[PDB]
Amino acid sequence: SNQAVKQRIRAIKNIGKITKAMKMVAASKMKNAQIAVEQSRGLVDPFVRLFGDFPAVNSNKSVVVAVTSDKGLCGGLNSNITKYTRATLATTESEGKDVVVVSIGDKGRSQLTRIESQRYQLAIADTYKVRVTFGQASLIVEELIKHNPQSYQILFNKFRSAISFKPTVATILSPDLLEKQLEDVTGNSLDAYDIEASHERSDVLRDLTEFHLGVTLYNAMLENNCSEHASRMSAMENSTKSAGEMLGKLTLDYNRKRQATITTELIEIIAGASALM
Amino acid sequence: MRYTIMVSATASDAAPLQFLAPYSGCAMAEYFRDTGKHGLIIYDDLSKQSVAYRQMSLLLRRPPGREAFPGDVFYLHSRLLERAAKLSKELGGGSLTAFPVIETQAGDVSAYIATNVISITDGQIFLETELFYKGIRPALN
Amino acid sequence: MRYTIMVSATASDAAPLQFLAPYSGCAMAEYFRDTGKHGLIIYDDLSKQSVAYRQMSLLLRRPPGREAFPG
Amino acid sequence: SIAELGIYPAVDPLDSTSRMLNPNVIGAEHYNVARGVQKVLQDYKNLQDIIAILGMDELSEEDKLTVARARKIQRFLSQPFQVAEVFTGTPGKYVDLADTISGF
Amino acid sequence: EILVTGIKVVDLLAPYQRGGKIGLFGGAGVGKTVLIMELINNVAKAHGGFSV
Amino acid sequence: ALTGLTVAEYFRDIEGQDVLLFVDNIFRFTQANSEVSALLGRIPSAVGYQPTLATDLGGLQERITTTTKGSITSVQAVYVPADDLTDPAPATTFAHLDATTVLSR
Amino acid sequence: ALTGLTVAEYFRDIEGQDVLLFVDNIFRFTQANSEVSALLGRIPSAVGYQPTL
Numbered sequence: 080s081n082q083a084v085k086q087r088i089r090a091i092k093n094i095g096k097i098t099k100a101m102k103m104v105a106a107s108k109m110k111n112a113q114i115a116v117e118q119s120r121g122l123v124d125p126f127v128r129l130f131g132d133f134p135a136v137n138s139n140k141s142v143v144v145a146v147t148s149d150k151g152l153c154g155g156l157n158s159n160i161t162k163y164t165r166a167t168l169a170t171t172e173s174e175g176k177d178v179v180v181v182s183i184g185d186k187g188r189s190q191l192t193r194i195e196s197q198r199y200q201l202a203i204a205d206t207y208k209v210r211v212t213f214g215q216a217s218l219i220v221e222e223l224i225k226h227n228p229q230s231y232q233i234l235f236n237k238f239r240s241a242i243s244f245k246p247t248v249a250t251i252l253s254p255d256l257l258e259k260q261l262e263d264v265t266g267n268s269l270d271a272y273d274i275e276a277s278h279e280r281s282d283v284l285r286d287l288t289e290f291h292l293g294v295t296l297y298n299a300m301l302e303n304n305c306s307e308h309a310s311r312m313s314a315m316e317n318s319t320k321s322a323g324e325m326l327g328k329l330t331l332d333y334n335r336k337r338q339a340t341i342t343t344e345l346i347e348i349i350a351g352a353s354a355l356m
Numbered sequence: 357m358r359y360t361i362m363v364s365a366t367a368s369d370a371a372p373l374q375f376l377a378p379y380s381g382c383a384m385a386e387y388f389r390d391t392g393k394h395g396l397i398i399y400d401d402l403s404k405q406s407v408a409y410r411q412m413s414l415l416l417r418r419p420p421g422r423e424a425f426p427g428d429v430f431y432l433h434s435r436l437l438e439r440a441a442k443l444s445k446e447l448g449g450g451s452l453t454a455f456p457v458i459e460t461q462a463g464d465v466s467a468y469i470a471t472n473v474i475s476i477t478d479g480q481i482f483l484e485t486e487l488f489y490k491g492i493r494p495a496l497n
Numbered sequence: 498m499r500y501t502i503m504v505s506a507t508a509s510d511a512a513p514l515q516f517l518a519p520y521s522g523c524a525m526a527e528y529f530r531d532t533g534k535h536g537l538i539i540y541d542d543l544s545k546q547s548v549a550y551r552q553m554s555l556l557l558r559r560p561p562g563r564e565a566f567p568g
Numbered sequence: 569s570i571a572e573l574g575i576y577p578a579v580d581p582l583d584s585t586s587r588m589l590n591p592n593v594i595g596a597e598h599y600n601v602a603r604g605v606q607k608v609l610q611d612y613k614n615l616q617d618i619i620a621i622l623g624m625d626e627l628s629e630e631d632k633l634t635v636a637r638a639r640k641i642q643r644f645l646s647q648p649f650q651v652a653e654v655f656t657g658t659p660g661k662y663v664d665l666a667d668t669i670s671g672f
Numbered sequence: 673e674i675l676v677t678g679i680k681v682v683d684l685l686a687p688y689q690r691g692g693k694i695g696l697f698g699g700a701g702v703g704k705t706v707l708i709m710e711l712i713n714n715v716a717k718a719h720g721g722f723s724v
Numbered sequence: 725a726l727t728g729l730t731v732a733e734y735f736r737d738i739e740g741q742d743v744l745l746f747v748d749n750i751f752r753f754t755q756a757n758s759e760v761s762a763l764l765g766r767i768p769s770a771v772g773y774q775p776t777l778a779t780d781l782g783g784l785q786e787r788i789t790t791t792t793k794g795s796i797t798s799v800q801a802v803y804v805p806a807d808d809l810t811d812p813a814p815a816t817t818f819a820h821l822d823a824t825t826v827l828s829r
Numbered sequence: 830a831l832t833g834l835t836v837a838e839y840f841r842d843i844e845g846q847d848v849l850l851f852v853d854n855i856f857r858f859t860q861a862n863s864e865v866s867a868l869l870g871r872i873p874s875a876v877g878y879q880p881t882l
């Protein structure tokens with residue numbers, strides 16, 4: 080009885096420091112990863128400056144990649160972009176296109192199969208174990224090249240600040256299948272460029288689309304990893320605050336039970352002493 | 357003070373005087389209740405009257421109960437607060453309104469005397485300290 | 498019922514009767530124990546026997562102990 | 569703890585019992601829906617500490633389904649009373665037994 | 673035999689017996705006089721016999 | 725503590741001064757009166773204090789006031805037992821206090 | 830317990846050999862002294878025990 084709350088105080092008092100240690104670990108990880116996000120943000124600009132940004136294309140085959148977390152104490156990150164995925168899979172699909180759903184992170188393979196069980200075809204995980212390199216995102220992009228869609232959709236949280244993480248849909252148009260077709264505006268928007276490659280414009284667009292997909296995927300899983308660390312930092316301080324308030328209420332009840340125990344034992348001793356005297 | 361009576365059994369006064377002072381005040385206000393007029397009474401800190409009565413009972417070698425209070429600490433306050441009545445037209449139509457004050461310890465509404473007087477009085481004006489140190493005064497919960 | 502005895506000192510009965518009902522039931526079942534048969538004695542609410550025994554002892558002025566129970 | 573949540577009458581459904589809650593007395597579907605409501609509420613009570621610490625966004629899908637159904641049946645067990653309409657203003661509701669069995 | 677009260681939690685999870693002892697537990701303003709007034713208002717008018 | 729009050733009551737009532745009275749550890753005044761109450765066979769109240777707890781504290785703390793001759797101002801060190809502000813000795817001592825001056829490490 | 834101890838103390842003191850004394854539930858010694866000590870005229874100690882624990 081009176082050691083039940085005395086041990087519960089120990090359990091919640093240790094959780095109130097485990098969650099604060101995890102908050103400081105997430106904060107140091109976000110500090111170390113923000114400088115990598117800000118360096119990687121630059122290379123995404125020339126591809127959306129050259130190839131534009133066309134999310135609402137009439138693709139026939141599309142691949143949607145939802146960049147989620149591995150560990151699940153992020154606090155509403157991997158479930159929010161699943162809302163954006165079901166709001167995006169229900170936006171492009173209006174005409175009978177084939178959709179592949181891919182997820183990076185274990186909390187994506189645990190949650191995209193919930194609402195989308197049959198169009199899901201690939202699960203990448205353990206991406207964030209040591210660090211994210213460009214060769215890793217290149218291999219993930221090559222496994223997205225094993226399928227041959229007409230567009231690529233990337234769902235990830237963009238690390239704007241430590242409080243705001245805007246979910247971002249990023250679109251990569253497949254080269255001769257759709258990329259030339261979206262630029263055919265009374266002629267073309269790509270004819271102004273003099274292709275100084277070894278082979279034709281179709282192959283330089285194939286290589287440019289693969290490189291743009293690799294860069295978008297690398298930046299997506301760096302943005303999502305840093306916003307994951309910021310979300311874990313902000314969700315291990317709601318837990319330290321709640322474990323502090325629960326520890327306060329348990330300490331108040333323990334003091335009440337402590338005083339009641341001393342009064343009860345004292346009353347028992349007095350009644351036993353007055354039964355004789 | 358032209359309308360106020362002030363009955364004071366302070367901290368240095370003897371515990372039977374702190375025990376009896378709510379009853380003295382309630383009689384002085386029952387004068388106005390019983391003759392058609394209207395009365396207000398504030399028994400400020402009945403939680404200290406119950407401590408005075410606990411002192412009186414434990415010095416009479418009476419067996420203590422929950423939180424070392426006597427068994428008739430409910431009767432102590434229900435005998436008092438049931439006199440705050442609104443009388444019928446045949447007895448005058450007079451009224452007496454009580455405002456007993458109870459001090460809790462850490463927001464512990466479920467104390468012995470607090471749950472005694474909550475189950476005697478009609479309403480309740482619970483004043484919270486978390487609203488009070490946030491500047492919201494009167495800190496009505 | 499053709500195999501069961503029902504000893505029942507209920508709440509309205511005196512505290513000596515509720516104190517003695519488990520021993521009376523065990524004495525009734527010791528007929529089947531002592532003569533080669535098998536008994537199943539079920540003392541429902543042995544805590545209520547303890548409460549009745551505490552009452553019967555506190556009124557006999559025996560000094561109480563922990564939780565006002567006798568020694 | 570249930571009155572401070574605004575639920576009225578503040579009955580603890582996991583501590584209020586009866587001897588009539590028996591399928592040989594009240595019928596099989598009444599007993600089944602009563603025990604199902606009680607199991608949903610007990611499974612919600614088992615998650616209150618982990619809802620408080622880790623938050624609502626860290627549960628499983630069956631966990632955040634049964635928490636939502638439990639929060640629906642917690643409010644649905646409350647009811648405006650006909651004698652309590654003089655200090656609340658909402659009118660009272662006499663529910664039939666078939667209505668509440670089917671509704672739960 | 674059951675006693676229908678018109679209260680949802682009472683009729684569902686702890687149904688009252690027509691001719692049985694019923695208790696309403698709770699302390700200091702949780703509503704056990706409003707609940708007994710509602711039980712009077714619901715049961716005693718649809719009873720026929722006498723009340724005390 | 726009553727002897728300290730008497731020496732200060734001379735300076736207030738005769739000399740007409742503003743006196744400081746440092747009752748060091750008022751909780752030890754409480755626990756000494758608890759001990760003399762237990763030695764006199766009185767039944768102890770809640771957590772273990774004397775049944776006259778508020779009255780002994782009031783008989784101390786009600787002589788420390790402003791008269792029309794002078795004033796006694798008491799700076800009392802307060803010990804809070806088992807880190808409990810709801811314990812009856814500090815919760816009775818806190819009823820008389822007008823200010824708290826918290827020295828922290 | 831005193832009886833079993835005396836049987837062991839004869840083997841230890843008179844015959845001078847190594848004895849093994851197994852006492853199952855020595856708590857029952859203090860419990861049994863507490864059961865009579867209230868009727869022996871002793872006002873009770875702490876959590877329910879005798880003053881001579």
Ligand SMILES: Nc1ncnc2c1ncn2[C@@H]1O[C@H](COP(=O)(O)OP(=O)(O)O)[C@@H](O)[C@H]1O
Pocket residue numbers: 474475576577647648649652656698699700701702703704705706707
């Ligand atoms: N069914 C209800 N609806 C709304 N308020 C209620 C209800 N039941 C109780 N209350 C609240 O509880 C207060 C008093 O409860 P009460 O019946 O007096 O409990 P008790 O008799 O245990 O003191 C009422 O003023 C009311 O505000």
Ligand SMILES: [Mg+2]
Pocket residue numbers: 704705
């Ligand atoms: Mg009532």
